[PDB]
């Protein structure tokens, strides 16, 4: 007896063909299908920041000496101080960048899951109820073709509205 | 009619502008402003700083007192402007550490 459960505090190790998807349970059995548009929408954003972190070319030629074999004093103290200042500032930039990036990546992938859920919520209208775990209880008989119509966005709520409302109340 | 429809929306413009974000090289937004000043009039405004135009004279020449720089005696400035056309016309001279003397007089 395995009941299905959604994304509320729960991932799917079994889904390998996409990043987001649907799992259903109806009269014909249980099934799973990935959602390609939302999977790629999250991937496209990660690709875009991968492109932007590498876009600048840092091309330097003749610079200053950074290693010294003899103690010299004032001028060498200054050359070392300049390079140590540059490294600490770039190290800070690198640390802050990946922190802002990862925070945003976690947010945008969490957002795609919510968008897909709300997109589904709008389709079902008064024919389903939020079970609270990331799943919908569809209050009418919904065969495989009916599940696919929800997955591909052609589900017409008026066809089943009378049946669904009678089961709800 | 027994029912009604109420839509919520936002404005749009025919031709928007491209901007960059963390993830996207170009996003079309309705409007943008430029943050990089890239143009000039070609002229130095004489206010509010006191600009002293060297004309034919370098600061070191006016310090020493080259005859055609006599007009600069006892002068003051916030910014001294040296021109390419400048030239010396007195005794040939050499200043060891010329850049340092120029810096401390100019400062």
């Amino acid at each position, epitope marked *: 007896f395995g009941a299905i459960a959604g994304f509320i505090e729960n991932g799917w190790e079994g889904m390998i063909d996409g990043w987001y998807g649907f799992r259903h349970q109806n009269s014909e059995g249980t099934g799973q299908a990935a959602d390609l548009k939302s999977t*790629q929408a999250a*991937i496209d954003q990660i*690709n875009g920041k991968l492109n932007r972190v590498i876009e600048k070319t840092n091309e330097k030629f003749h610079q200053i000496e950074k290693e010294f074999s003899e103690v010299e004093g004032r001028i060498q103290d200054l050359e070392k101080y300049v390079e140590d200042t540059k490294i600490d500032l770039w190290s800070y930039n690198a640390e802050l960048l990946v922190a802002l990036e990862n925070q945003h990546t976690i947010d945008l992938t969490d957002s795609e899951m919510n968008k897909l859920f709300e997109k589904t919520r709008r389709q079902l209208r008064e024919n389903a109820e939020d079970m609270g775990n990331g799943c919908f209880k569809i209050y009418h008989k919904c065969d495989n073709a009916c599940i696919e119509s929800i997955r591909n966005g052609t589900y017409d709520h008026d066809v089943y509205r009378d049946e669904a409302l009678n089961n709800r109340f | 009619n027994s029912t009604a429809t109420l839509c919520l929306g936002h404005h749009a413009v025919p031709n928007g502008t491209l901007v960059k974000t963390i993830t996207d090289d170009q996003i079309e937004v309705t409007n943008a402003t430029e943050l990089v000043q890239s143009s000039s009039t070609g002229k130095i405004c004489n206010n509010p700083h006191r600009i002293l135009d060297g004309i034919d004279c370098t600061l070191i020449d006016a310090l020493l007192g080259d005859p055609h720089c006599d007009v600069f005696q006892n002068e003051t400035w916030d910014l001294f402007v040296e021109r390419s056309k400048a030239f010396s016309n007195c005794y040939p001279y050499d200043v060891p550490d010329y850049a340092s003397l120029r810096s401390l007089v100019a400062s």
Partner: antibody
């Protein structure tokens, strides 16, 4: 190996619509996209648009927006390009080319953001 | 649209020559610049992808360099097969834009 095979040449009247097809083999169709490039007689190359074999998403060049619609079919590994309200301006050789990897995050040097391989080309002539 | 400017538009050279053609972008495109070779009656073929990468099976004499706004394609030693038209193309932003092309012609 990896190959794109296009439909035969077409001749059309100014008001009409043309539909070019691109048949793929040698790779997973649904993991990449297809871009469309045309070349007027004695002229340079011009990009029309792109469609993903993974999602069906499309990007059209602004000047063909409204006029073009690109479709893809995973079951037959075929992408199509429809151009409407033709003109003598549209007389050109139309190419399809595999473009952009899909279904996974890719570093730039592995993004396949380049046109390869190309189809043999489809010649479209529009004249009254 | 990002404007790609190729220099020169025409070039005359002999077999065995070393030639370099230049691609310029109106704004930075990173390394998303591709090079295509087109022989007169044939479709274009990819030669260099992502600025410096030789397409598999491509001749070793072809090499590419550059980043951001400046790019170049080099042929170490010209061959009879290499007299053709060469286009650079940017893939960083949509719409994808091509250069006007460089035609390699036989010197005489």
């Amino acid at each position: 190996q990896v190959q794109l095979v296009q439909s035969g040449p077409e001749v059309k009247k100014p008001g009409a619509s043309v539909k070019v097809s691109c048949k793929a083999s040698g790779y997973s169709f649904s993991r990449y996209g297809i871009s469309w490039v045309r070349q007027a007689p004695g002229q340079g190359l011009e990009w029309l648009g792109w469609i993903s074999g993974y999602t069906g998403n499309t990007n059209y060049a602004q000047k063909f927006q409204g006029r073009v619609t690109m479709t893809t079919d995973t079951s037959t590994s075929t992408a199509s390009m429809e151009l409407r309200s033709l003109r003598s301006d549209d007389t050109a050789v139309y190419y399809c080319a595999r473009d952009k990897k899909q279904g996974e995050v890719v570093l730039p040097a592995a993004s396949f953001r380049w046109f390869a391989p190309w189809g043999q080309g489809t010649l479209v002539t529009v004249s009254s | 649209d990002i404007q790609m400017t190729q220099s020169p538009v025409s070039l005359s050279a002999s077999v065995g020559d070393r030639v370099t053609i230049t691609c310029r972008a109106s704004q930075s495109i990173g390394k998303f610049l591709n090079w295509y070779q087109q022989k007169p009656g044939r479709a274009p073929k990819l030669l260099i992808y992502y600025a410096s990468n030789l397409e598999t099976g491509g001749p070793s004499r072809f090499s590419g360099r550059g980043s951001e706004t400046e790019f170049s394609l080099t042929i170490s030693s010209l061959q009879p097969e290499d007299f053709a038209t060469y286009y650079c193309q940017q893939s960083n932003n949509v719409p994808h834009t091509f250069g006007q092309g460089t035609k390699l012609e036989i010197k005489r």
